[PDB]
């Protein structure tokens, strides 16, 4: 309570001295024992959890990052360091400081749901011994515990931005003590990366209006940015940057037999150990060298098709070596369990995976289901899979290290590889505390030799403001939403409050000319003309409408909201209730293409389509004539924006897919019927699950109760992909769509019935879906059919009791 963490005395002195000197002391003149983690007054429960696996001492840069400046006093901090250097620890120690000393709540923000889920359990494991409640706000997932009874909320960008807005309407902004942002370089330009700016600017604006002692501390972290100092000034934060890295990493490119360093100085020549009797660029040979040293290798490939092709080739030579240098020495018993977990899945065991996985080889792309990739990542992380051929999708995903990383080509998707993508790939080489080094090899040809060097000698592009206006397009989505949030939320009323806000943006930090100040005024006008905001005339004062407050509470983009609002009023004038199709059309997202739709397949399902669903189609805009003009001819046309008709048919097509999906139609059947892979479907439902929740809230705030009533059941049905009967069962964590079904078909319709269940009977029911651990969960200890059965019944009782998580 008094002091949860305090640094060793005079450690700040020495480090401040060394930093102020022209050159660093050959021997650091401070007790090397002072960077021992136990001397910082850390509570015992956390000190052991850190010492649980490594984490005994701090780095030179970690001590300087805390001690140099007023970081520990409450000052905002923005620091950058290479990956796997212990960037997590700096933030963890700061969160633990403020939460226990100032008794306020912290916010941890991560880019993706998968890394957010990983972080939730990772933060739960460290802080549960000190009574620190850690839950998560991810995608469609909602915390069981109220926000008032939490300490650390782990969120994605969208959910965090929404959570901030909730706290403004309830005036409980005082609860929030600090916000931690991982990967701050995604601030510049992204599909959702811009929301991170709106979030931070909103915090900087509120704390500035109270400036007219500590407030809300912001701890941001990222990769080496050229304009990182520009970001620190924007957030009024102290800056820190280091290149320190516990495992030195070598980036190298390979031409012919020769392998080269960044400087182009040849570092090693290369002679393949084995001969793949295939014109190869020694690709199999490079992987083989790594495996023999009892390690694992990540192989990144441009297309989804190369990964499967390459995993098959690698597996084939592994086959040849076994029946004829040394062999791959894999673990067969543990590999069979992996295949069995794959076998017992809603997707089944992929044919290419069936060949390669037995020989410690696998691939990873967006074509696979989220359940297959969770298995492969876990298998690779354990060492069961030694070779993993992935795409650029994995490079930005979860934490998954390997000894050697190989990039097949600097040309991804017919275009040169982005610099940020390259740095994310080569960044996964080197496990802190296990491997001595992380090696990165970029395989190239003679024509593309100059382009390969460009990547090793490359740096991140400067961070854009993402609210820029390029001449004619004076208005922009990101700005409109940002302006809407501050007016509707009630933190900006007058015209004077508006110009105060313009100062807090990252955009005005970029000038330190004020031509963008007039753009703010344009968004306000846009909001007035479209009934989002009201104006009452020492300047005119504004206020939110019902449509304004509804749009904000729904987390919808104002540009999209206009069309959503019209579509809903039209549906409530004439609505089809005999099926679920018309409801689904309203919650079908069409802001991005989720697949390349085959129109001929579409037209065949159209004739065969029942009358009840054709009525919904006609009622929407689906013309049979346009479907015919799609099959005969591939004319996108799109000459006239009045060709949204294209979007309508794409939307109705998508709505058909979601209909079979919540009707518990197998993913393989849906694939044959429509012509899209299981990866695109799963990506679609999680997109539609989120959108369905938005439309429900939007309908609730407008008073459209009847429409809301129908919609308020589909966020859950889209998430798990179930029918109404299974809605009660899926409340259990361990129960997905398939397990919920076999339990329903056996007599367990509700949670109440599931608490009364006999354990040995559940195991038997499980046996029908086929000490062997054969059942996968999320964050799974590879449950046995016995362990899983006992956990489900115990949990069903816990949910019925509503005791704790």
Numbering used by the authors: 35 to 246, 256 to 367, 377 to 564, 575 to 599, 605 to 837, 858 to 892
Sentences reproduced from the published study:
DNA polymerase theta (Polθ) has been identified as a crucial alternative non-homologous end-joining factor in mammalian cells. Polθ is distinct among human DNA polymerases, exhibiting not only a C-terminal DNA polymerase domain (Seki et al., 2003, Shima et al., 2003, Yousefzadeh and Wood, 2013) but also an N-terminal domain exhibiting similarity and motifs typical of superfamily 2 (SF2) helicases (Singleton et al., 2007), separated by a long and lesser-conserved central domain of unknown function (Seki et al., 2003, Shima et al., 2003, Yousefzadeh and Wood, 2013) (Singleton et al., 2007). The Polθ helicase domain (Polθ-HLD) is a member of the SF2 helicases, most closely related to the Ski2/Hel308 family of helicases, which are involved in the ATP-dependent 3′-5′ unwinding of lagging strands on replication forks (Tafel et al., 2011, Buttner et al., 2007, Guy and Bolt, 2005), thought to facilitate replication restart at stalled or damaged forks. Like its archaeal homologs, Polθ-HLD comprises five subdomains including the two core helicase domains and three additional, closely associated globular domains.
Using a slightly longer construct (residues 1–894), we obtained crystals of the apo protein, which diffracted to 3.55-Å resolution in a different crystal form containing four copies of Polθ-HLD in the asymmetric unit. Slight differences are seen in the ordering and positioning of various loops that are probably a result of local crystal contacts, as well as minor differences in domain orientation with the nucleotide-bound complexes (discussed later). In the apo crystals, 32 additional residues can be seen at the N terminus. These residues form an extended loop and α-helix (only fully ordered in chain A, due to crystal packing), which packs against the rest of the D1 domain and is unique among the structures of SF2 helicases solved to date. Analysis of the asymmetric unit of the apo crystals reveals four forming a tetrameric clover-shaped molecule with D2 symmetry. Each subunit in the potential tetramer contacts all three of its neighbors, with the interface between chains AC and BD in the apo crystals being slightly more extensive (850-Å2 interface area) and hydrophobic than the interface linking chains AD and BC (600-Å2 interface area), as calculated by the program PISA. Finally, a much smaller interface (180 Å2) that is composed entirely of polar contacts connects AB and CD. The interfaces are almost entirely composed of contacts from the inserted regions of domain 4, explaining why the quaternary structure is not generally conserved across the Hel308 family (archaeal Hel308/Hjm proteins were reported to be monomeric). Furthermore, the fact that the D1 and D2 domains are not constrained by symmetry contacts suggests they would be free to move relative to each other as is required for the helicase mechanism.
